[PDB]
Design a binder for this molecule. Structure first.
Ligand SMILES: O=C1N[C@@H](Cc2cnc[nH]2)C(=O)N2CCC[C@@H]12
Ligand SMILES: O=C1N[C@@H](Cc2cnc[nH]2)C(=O)N2CCC[C@@H]12
Ligand SMILES: O=C1N[C@@H](Cc2cnc[nH]2)C(=O)N2CCC[C@@H]12
Ligand SMILES: O=C1N[C@@H](Cc2cnc[nH]2)C(=O)N2CCC[C@@H]12
Lengths: 496, 497
């Protein structure tokens, strides 16, 4: 099955309203930059962003020029002429609109509140999809909290029911309308709905993990924002999942959630696979097409794992654009984020940056010895390991933010496509390294095991293994006289 | 309120059938050994044991000569003439009959299954109580678990309803019929029903904790079987309550159930108090009137916390009676258990035992250097600390197994009575020591705390404290923008005044 390659196409309202493909000073990344070759390398483009308004319906930004918007969307759907499997999804939400303190947060919370609000909301999603010509619905609420989860689930189920009906009504059996969400790629946010992951994922074609931004100026120590595996020399974190509303025992929580742990892409993927009913094929690994920059770092480890003096606030609370050589940073008044495109230019420019590689995390980073700068980003090299991991772990594919940050030749996108599909690319010998793997074990990833059948009336010592009701169980203490499942002295440790 | 002093009177069916008060070779402990003085020192005598039959009704062992049974019970109820507060309870169950592998286990499980079976069982408990002249019902099922607990709770509620009506019918308001149970005194068995303790205890006058047998041949390291407090030098154990179906978060489980911990009397009592709705006044501390002996122990520490070579099988699998001077052991064919009466005689027999004291656990122990023996038991001195603990903790009283193991003069019972009621006994200055106290805290026994009210729209740093909806909450990590409650980021740490 072809791996999904989902790229976000984000365009601010002001750019839509002034849309042009001949002046990058107004629209830096027009749809025409998505050449036929690039359209063939994508399976999905997530058009973004739409929102949920006070009327609790899916809708464009009020300031949007509709004829302009439709024309932009039509240019994107026209790309399908180059790739019959291509889908132009539209995404609702994103951090700005939907974070707890975001301008539209209330609408997300209220829209999923009742059977009626959900019905109205779900209907608007499908209506918007059909009217503008999109191929699916993607919801990026960052993120529903514990009490809002059931409503969120019910809303996704409603959208799924309606989409499946629309696919039949439109004869799209060959390319069904889809439903996806951008899910948390770190344990802290994931813990909000983690306990109901199976229900959240059931109505979806894919759950696209934002397995990046795992480091940022809000953190005291600089770190890789998307390390595939862990580096013991880097910071470790409190494992928030052991505090999720799971209802599991101390032993169960502890073995599934070691704490502290390395916040990596592998951690997030494994944490999802630990839950039963969460199929690997629906998990999509997100990767960033931009780097995060920090200033005020010291030496010793190339800028890694150092204290820093980078403002964490949004908007950038200053006019000091200190990321040397970063022109886009001045355009965007923020030296803390730089697109791969810009980073590549900074490296070939003799600005003082040294590209280094951490072979445990399997990611690159820049260090500016003279000015004390550190940049954590991804490139075609780090993508080799992520792509192999996606294949080895049987994941659904890759998602990335965002298309306008790839270089002009579309090299990052082309690398991902190459790793999955080129007949002449062979990663059978690519060494995945010794970086730390997430070792938690949960109900969803129990190892296959064998054990004598449990015998009613038998007394077992501590550590005894038996098979019962399809699983292998082990005693937590001694003199066990009851059966697995009826006696809380037994820990389920294997399956089959 | 007077502290309860509940003593078990246990008599095997063969002794009942051959009951006599003039041959200790046949009946080692006849009711006649309970003088008026002893009857006045007791508030309850738990006659034991009756059982639950295959018809799922409370019943005497079928091999019991009924007339002889009524006569033994009559002798006990006759003691009420010496003490208008005394109750002769009868106990259903006990280890032999009701443990998972016991001969009658299935009957306990099945009797509590449905409204019908529970009504039939409860009615039989009251019928037996009235037919033989008992003053209450005590149930010693060791122990209900899992899916059995709700039935067990409903059975207890039904018996309570029937007993209360019986009290009115009989004009027994001055001495109401009572209902109690013998409860686990250690976390492993306690974890079976721990999560529903409040419901179990609601219908009871007392829950009598079997806070002893916390050490035994089944354990690889010798230890005190009823340490009041912990000794950091002794063995520690896995805290099984961490595995009970409570629905608490990892932090809550960790805070409530330190592990490993010292398996002690204080730990059991505190574990019960940790649960919301369990009043201290209904908790009864059980104490042993017998000691447990081990052989093959190493010296250097009075035989404490040593490796040993004591058989664990039951019955005692050998003919070798190695507890020096314990003739009772020969009679009973087991050198691993000795009554305090017998242990006291061994200490007066110049047999080479040293009586030592652990000032952390507040319990005595015997050490036989020459033969490598260790005996953990309780005596009048350890009872001073336990009695003070019962007073300080506002517990309901003390329970003990069993009357026949006190010495002929009834000294251990007299001590307990003295510590609670004598005008001339003063423990105001008794030093409770520095042994380890159980310090877990559960969402149900949180301290009063004070903190600013939560402010919606605020971002909280790690460790921040706020008050919200009756509780004080602490953030477990930073950048918290969510409200206290189910949200995983917040931890309930205290109650708002
Ligand atoms: O709003 C966005 N913002 C960026 C950055 C980011 C958001 N949440 C975490 N990181 C992104 O990657 N996106 C992925 C989908 C949401 C969209
Ligand atoms: O400020 C944040 N930002 C998001 C990511 C993001 C994407 N675009 C903007 N912000 C995050 O992961 N966070 C972690 C905690 C701070 C919080
Ligand atoms: O069966 C029993 N046997 C003894 C010993 C023991 C039982 N469970 C743990 N220890 C006892 O104390 N009992 C207290 C009530 C049950 C009665
Ligand atoms: O073997 C056991 N015996 C019981 C006590 C008992 C009383 N009379 C006989 N045995 C006990 O407390 N246990 C604790 C665990 C071992 C188990």
């Amino acid at each position: 099955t072809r791996k999904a390659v989902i790229g976000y196409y984000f365009i601010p309202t002001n750019q839509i309203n002034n849309y042009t493909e001949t002046d990058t000073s107004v629209v830096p990344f027009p749809v025409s930059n998505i050449t036929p070759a690039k359209a063939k390398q994508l399976t999905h483009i997530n058009f973004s962003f739409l929102d949920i308004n006070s009327n609790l319906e899916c809708a464009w930004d009020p300031a949007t020029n509709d004829a302009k918007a439709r024309d932009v969307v039509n240019r994107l759907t026209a790309l399908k002429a180059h790739n019959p499997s291509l889908r132009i999804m539209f995404s609702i939400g994103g951090w700005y609109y939907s974070n707890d303190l975001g301008v539209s947060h209330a609408n997300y919370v209220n829209a999923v509140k009742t059977p009626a609000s959900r019905a109205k909301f779900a209907q608007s999603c499908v209506r918007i999809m059909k009217d503008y010509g999109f191929d699916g619905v993607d919801i990026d609420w960052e993120y529903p909290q514990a009490a809002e989860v059931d409503g969120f689930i019910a809303a996704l189920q409603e959208i799924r029911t309606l989409l499946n009906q629309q696919t039949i009504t439109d004869g799209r059996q060959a390319l069904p309308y889809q439903l996806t969400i951008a899910g948390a790629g770190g344990a802290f946010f994931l813990s909000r709905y983690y306990s109901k992951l199976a229900q959240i994922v059931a109505p979806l074609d894919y759950i696209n993990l934002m397995t990046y931004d795992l480091a940022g100026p809000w953190e005291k120590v600089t770190n890789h924002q998307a390390a595939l595996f862990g580096d013991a020399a880097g910071p470790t974190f409190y494992n928030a999942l052991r505090e999720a509303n799971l209802g599991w025992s101390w032993e169960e929580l502890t073995r599934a959630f070691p704490s502290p742990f390395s916040l990596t892409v592998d951690a997030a993927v494994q944490q999802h696979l630990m839950m039963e009913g969460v199929p690997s094929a629906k998990i999509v690994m997100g990767v960033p097409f931009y780097g995060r920059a920090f200033k005020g770092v010291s030496g010793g480890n190339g800028g890694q794992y150092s204290s820093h003096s980078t403002p964490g606030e949004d908007p950038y609370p200053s006019t000091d654009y200190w990321l040397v050589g970063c022109e886009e940073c001045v355009r965007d008044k923020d030296p803390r984020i730089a697109s791969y495109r810009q980073l590549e230019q900074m490296l070939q420019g003799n600005y003082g940056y040294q590209r280094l590689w951490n072979d445990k995390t399997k990611t690159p980073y820049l260090y500016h010895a003279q000015n004390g700068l550190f940049v954590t980003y991804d490139d075609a090299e780090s993508f080799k390991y992520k792509a192999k991991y996606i294949k080895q772990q049987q994941l659904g594919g890759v998602m990335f933010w965002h298309l306008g940050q790839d270089n002009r030749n579309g090299d990052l996108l082309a690398a991902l496509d190459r790793y999955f599909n080129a007949a002449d690319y062979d990663d059978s010998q690519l060494d995945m390294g010794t970086g730390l793997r997430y070792t938690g074990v949960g109900p969803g990833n129990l190892p296959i095991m064998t054990a004598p059948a449990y015998v009613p009336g038998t007394t077992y010592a501590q550590g005894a293994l038996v098979s019962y009701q399809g699983y292998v169980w082990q005693t937590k203490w001694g003199y066990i006289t009851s059966a697995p499942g009826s006696d809380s002295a037994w820990l389920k440790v294997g399956r089959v």
